[PDB]
Amino acid sequence: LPFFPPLYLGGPEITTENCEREPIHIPGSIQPHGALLTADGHSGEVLQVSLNAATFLGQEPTVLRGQTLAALLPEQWPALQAALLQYRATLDWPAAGHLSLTVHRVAELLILEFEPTHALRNAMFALESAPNLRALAEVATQTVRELTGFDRVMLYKFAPDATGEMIAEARREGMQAFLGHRFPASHTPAQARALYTRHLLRLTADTRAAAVPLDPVLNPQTNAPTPLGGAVLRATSPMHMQYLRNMGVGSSLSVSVVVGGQLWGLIVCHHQTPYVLPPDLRTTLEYLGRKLSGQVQRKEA
Ligand SMILES: *C/C=C1/C(=C/c2[nH]c(/C=C3[NH+]=C(/C=C4\NC(=O)C(C=C)=C4C)C(C)=C\3CCC(=O)O)c(CCC(=O)O)c2C)NC(=O)[C@H]1C
After folding, report:
1. Contact 27, 227 (CB under 8 A)
2. Domain 117-207+237-301 adopts which CATH fold?
């Protein structure tokens, strides 16, 4: 069923009667482990600023808004113009350390995300070399756990009725096994599955952290919601954050397994405490997800 309007445009709050209608791609807010700016794709005027931006950028949102990326990021703007796809850079000026910058374009808007910042050969080989699907799933979960340190890494496979089952698991010594457990379709509702066919990694770094609004919440170009499906800092559905908290999960991350353009499954990662998977490790997981997807497709053929 069609998306409801977002809450800030008067849409209903989601219940178990209408899981699938939540417009999860346009929450108008981000997770607090990074900052997000949006900017006009021609002028570089900063249009929207997350309310926490001073934490990462050292200037208040009121000061940042209306400035150009030419003024604020003199080195990256030309490279940004040229490049914009993701553009990625490391910024060295924080006293806090270094910042990872990730940019993507949606229509006429640039979306800029800032957060603090042979294993590959081996992981790729492991995946390519698995001779059957069970071995592939086992090696994928083990490899992701090894790389990330997550407490629990599972492979969740969708059935034709969109229920799912955990079909492989790597987990911390002594943790109760979730392998073999099955869950209803509504736990990963259809609009989420659809989004996950287009934007292949998403996460919640702290399942108890309040979302941070974008200000203004609407894109001034369009007077409409800002597309955040491609922003890993996007705020997570409240329904899902509650699901995670009730499971004792402090941090969650999944990677899509896409076969024939359909969502075959998810690599599902949990940590019991909050945990910000480092930026370079996300990129690695993306690579691994694509490889896993290719191998699942290869094997089913
Ligand atoms: C009425 C709405 C409901 C709801 C919505 C919902 N769920 C997601 C996203 C996910 N659900 C996942 C399901 C599982 N994770 C597990 O660990 C297990 C079992 C042990 C299951 C079945 C997963 C993996 C995701 C993806 C995100 C992630 O990796 O953390 C969304 C979309 C969240 C977002 O991207 O903003 C939504 C709207 N879930 C329900 O249970 C009902 C109440």
Report:
1. no
2. Beta-Lactamase (3.30.450)
Tell me the CATH architecture of domain 1-116+208-236. 2-Layer Sandwich (3.30)
Ligand 1 pocket list (CB less than 6 A): 14, 16, 19, 22, 24, 164, 178, 183, 186-189, 192, 202, 204, 236-237, 239-240, 243, 252-254, 266, 268
Domain locations in the chain as residue ranges = 1-116+208-236, 117-207+237-301
Phi then psi for residue 277, to 5 deg, are: -65, 130
What CA–CA distances, in Å, run from 231 to 18, 123, 295?
24, 26, 27
Report which of 139, 96, 142, 121 is spatially closest to residue 296, judged by C-alpha positions.
139
Distance CA 34, CA 32 (A): 5
What method did the depositors use to determine the structure? X-ray
